[PDB]
Structures are given as C-alpha cells and as structure tokens.
Design a protein around this ligand. Structure first.
Ligand SMILES: *[C@@](O)(C(=O)NCc1ccccn1)[C@H](CCC)NC(=O)[C@H](CC(C)C)NC(=O)OCc1ccccc1
Length: 220
C-alpha cells in the first residue's frame, strides 16, 4: 500500500464544516464519507445535508443532536432513497422535524461496509476506497487545544469512542519519539480548530483512540 495518501488532492473532500452545539458529529462524518463515494462515482463533489440526517434518520437508530452512528446514516440514505444537498437543506444545529425532499436529493447508497477492527485493514481501505468514517475517543483537553503535529494522548481509549470523524488519508513526518505515522482526520469543529480543522492522529500505535474500531464507508 502507499506510504502517504491524501484524498483532498484528488477532489474527494469538501471544506471543513462546523457542527455547532449539536451532537451531530456522526452526521458530518457520514456526509463526508458519502461526499467521497459520490465523487468517486460521478466525478462531481456536492456538499450534503447533515441536517437531513439529524432530522430524519431516527428510524435507523440515530438520536439527532443527542448522537448517532454513521452506519445508521448510511442505512437511512438507502432506506430513504436519497439525501438532500447542503445548499437545499442547510445546517441549523438543532433537531427539527424531517423536511427531506426527494427533488433535491443528490446522493444515494446501497448499504455500507464495516472495516475489520485493525489499523492494517483501515490503511488498506483508505488507500483504495477513499475517505472513511471512523469513531474516536475525543474526550480529552489535549484534543481541544490541538494545533499541529501528531496527536497522541496516553489516556486515550481504544474501545470507548465518543466522536465521529473522517479519515481522508495518512502519512508520516519525523518526530522526536520516532512514532512518525499518522492518520489525516477531518473534524467538524470549523477551520479554527486544529490544523485548519484537521488533526494528524497517531497511526500504528495500538489503535490509538480507537480509530480503527468502528470504521466504515457507504456503498455507492
Ligand atoms: C459527537 O462527538 C459530537 O457531536 N461532538 C461535539 C458535540 C457538540 C455538542 C454536544 C455534544 N457533542 C457526538 C456527541 C455525542 C452527543 N458523538 C456521537 O454522536 C457518537 C458517535 C459515535 C460514532 C461514537 N455517538 C453517540 O454518542 O451515540 C449515542 C447513541 C446512543 C444510543 C443509540 C444511538 C446513539
């Protein structure tokens, strides 16, 4: 597999978004992964509606601003037969009734794939498929104040993930500790967080923060 991958360079990735004060990270991770697979298929990158998922995918198991799972969002898009664009169904950061409108649907999927819970399998999936939805343990002061470098938090759990994000690649840079590999991760806290809204998460360090425990992507 390649040593460095960055799907932003191949057109698969929209700009960083900001979920506000709604617990909808799962919806931003899911739209990011589906933005990437829709682009793979059609060659057109269209920003997709997180609000659509927040308001409407409750029947698949999601709980709006109180949390959800990317696989439930992928299920919704399939069950529902579509997903509206960001421009047509903009983000309000609050749960409201479902206003999905099929005329404005710009994406679909036929299910999803759950990646084996190993960083080796995550790597192979990122290298071949595109951006991948993942869950991580983001509950640490260090994650809030991240600015640059390879994020490593010794108290990070590999089974208790609380936060959905999007792996858009991986790479390496020399470091003091010679733990040089990272996942390139798009967050949903705006551009002012981290490195333009991205974080380099430690890679091949015992599934740091559980990034490989709940990884998946939609089938397009
Ligand atoms: C996500 O981390 C998030 O949105 N973080 C920022 C934020 C802003 C405002 C309030 C809270 N958080 C989000 C927060 C939890 C509310 N995390 C999730 O939704 C996670 C994601 C998974 C992949 C780990 N899911 C979650 O907590 O699911 C709860 C749940 C319980 C039962 C059934 C379905 C979902």
């Amino acid at each position: 597999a390649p040593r460095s991958v960055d799907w932003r360079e191949k057109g698969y990735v929209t700009p960083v978004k900001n979920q506000g004060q709604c617990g909808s990270c799962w919806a931003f991770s899911a739209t990011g992964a589906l933005e990437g697979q829709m682009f793979r298929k059609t060659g057109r990158l269209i920003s997709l509606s997180e609000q659509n998922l927040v308001d409407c995918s409750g029947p698949q198991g999601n709980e709006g601003c109180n949390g959800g799972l990317m696989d439930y969002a992928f299920q919704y898009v399939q069950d529902n037969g579509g997903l509206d664009s960001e421009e047509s169904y903009p983000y309000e950061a609050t749960e409201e009734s479902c206003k999905y409108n099929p005329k404005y649907s710009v994406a679909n999927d036929a299910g999803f794939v759950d990646i084996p819970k190993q960083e080796k399998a995550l790597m192979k999936a990122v290298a071949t498929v595109g951006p991948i939805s993942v869950a991580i343990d983001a509950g640490h002061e260090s994650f809030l104040f991240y600015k640059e470098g390879i994020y490593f938090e010794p108290d990070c759990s590999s089974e208790d993930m609380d936060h959905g994000v999007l792996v858009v690649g991986y790479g390496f840079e020399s470091t003091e500790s010679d733990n040089n590999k990272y996942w390139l991760v798009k967050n949903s806290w705006g551009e002012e967080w981290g490195m333009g809204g991205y974080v380099k998460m430690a890679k091949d360090r015992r599934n740091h923060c559980g990034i490989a425990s709940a990884a998946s992507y939609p089938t397009v």
